[PDB]
Amino acid sequence: MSRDAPIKADKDYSQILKEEFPKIDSLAQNDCNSALDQLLVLEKKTRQASDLASSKEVLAKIVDLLASRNKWDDLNEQLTLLSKKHGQLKLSIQYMIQKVMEYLKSSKSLDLNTRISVIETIRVVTENKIFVEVERARVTKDLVEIKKEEGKIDEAADILCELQVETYGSMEMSEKIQFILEQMELSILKGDYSQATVLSRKILKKTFKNPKYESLKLEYYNLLVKISLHKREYLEVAQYLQEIYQTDAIKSDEAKWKPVLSHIVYFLVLSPYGNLQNDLIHKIQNDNNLKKLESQESLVKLFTTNELMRWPIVQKTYEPVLNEDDLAFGGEANKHHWEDLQKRVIEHNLRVISEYYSRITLLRLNELLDLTESQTETYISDLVNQGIIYAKVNRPAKIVNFEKPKNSSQLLNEWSHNVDELLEHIETIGHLITKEEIMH
Amino acid sequence: GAVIAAIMQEAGLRAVRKNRYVILQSDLEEAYATQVKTDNTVDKFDFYK
């Protein structure tokens, strides 16, 4: 580092011990300790450079042993001990570690190795601050995969979720996206969805702009479909599939967009009214690629336009069609997204009937909806709390008066305007009579 | 009252960093730590003790 004497002299010695490289090897075959004793000397120098040369020898020696679990503990330990003392500067020993760390990866061919290796790696890097930390997490992560096949899937997932929140400057944008995606998946498997919302917001939508990041954009939004679908917010779920459809890769290729559009229609319907909900399902109603499918096309069309329809007949239509399409209705907790399809159909009929029918008997309304008396009243009530419609339902079951009782002033206002339209209408007509007679 | 108004606002700055829409007690404790340790007179008061 300092003076001009260490650069030359130290290098000179490492050359001399690199000519004496076969000597170190031959002794290593007879006993480990004899050759080990040589590595100790090498990694005490004062120039940073001469330790680069020498940190090949530290990696090579244990390779010639091949490799020994007991011996493994010591090599990684010796490094840790050298780091605290000096390491020829604390920045120096981090590049040494980085060289030996590739060997750890590729040594791997046992469970046995993997377990010992994670114990050495976690410790080293707690006082380091570079790319070492990415690599530690990654090798730790091999044992995570293995932990998945155990009861330790909850536990492992946690260990690892913590780590990547610390933003290392050593990662590239492409690596940063990938590592956080891994965390989001582990949280699904953990079954903690609270963790996953914090990880989704960690990376941004404003990191995907160039076609380099195209791939990781697709995995990103697909992951958010599940996180939400579990919390049953069905409008948000439509939204992610719509963004995947906006992706260039899906757009270009005919095959890729097929299940995505199908899925789009389902979660938009499953969403209960909202005016935002309406403009999204009308946007999809315009799309050309949907019109080739006829099952999704009739479904979207039904819900958009104002119709009266009955639930076991709609159920009979789409039971052998849509209900057997997986990741919508054919999953298990999507059996209860099928059940949900009914609520959305009987809310559609309530909205229609509210507008057009000013009054209808309750006895009748029950029949058309395909519900029992009790379940009709509670559904009317919930939809009046949520402030969309208004009714007055009798408990004797004589009527339901789907109207909000009209106000005196508005009625009179409405009447005064009609009279002005009659007088305007006649005033314009008289001119056009004159026009037609003379032209004839 | 002002420092306490600065606390919630600075905590919710830290909210964006951490990438949450909620403020926790960890945010509050750092908000507390600073904005209240201005000047050094420690040295001067050694000889005015």
From Swiss-Prot, chain A:
All copies of domain PCI, residue ranges: 233-407
Modified residues (N-acetylserine): S2
Maturation and modification: N-acetylated by NAT1.
Coiled coil: none
Family: Belongs to the proteasome subunit p55 family.
PANTHER family named in the record: 26S PROTEASOME NON-ATPASE REGULATORY SUBUNIT 12 (PTHR10855:SF1), 26S PROTEASOME NON-ATPASE REGULATORY SUBUNIT 12/COP9 SIGNALOSOME COMPLEX SUBUNIT 4 (PTHR10855)
Function statement: Acts as a regulatory subunit of the 26S proteasome which is involved in the ATP-dependent degradation of ubiquitinated proteins.
Name recorded for this polypeptide: 26S proteasome regulatory subunit RPN5
Organism lineage: Eukaryota, Fungi, Dikarya, Ascomycota, Saccharomycotina
Primary gene name: RPN5
Swiss-Prot record, chain B:
Highest rank taxon of the organism: Eukaryota
Subcellular compartments: Cytoplasm; Nucleus
Cystine bridges: none
UniProt PTM: N-acetylated by NAT3.
Function, in words: The 26S proteasome is involved in the ATP-dependent degradation of ubiquitinated proteins. The regulatory (or ATPase) complex confers ATP dependency and substrate specificity to the 26S complex.
Family: Belongs to the AAA ATPase family.
Protein name: 26S proteasome regulatory subunit 6B homolog
First-to-last residue of the parent protein present: 380 to 428 of 428
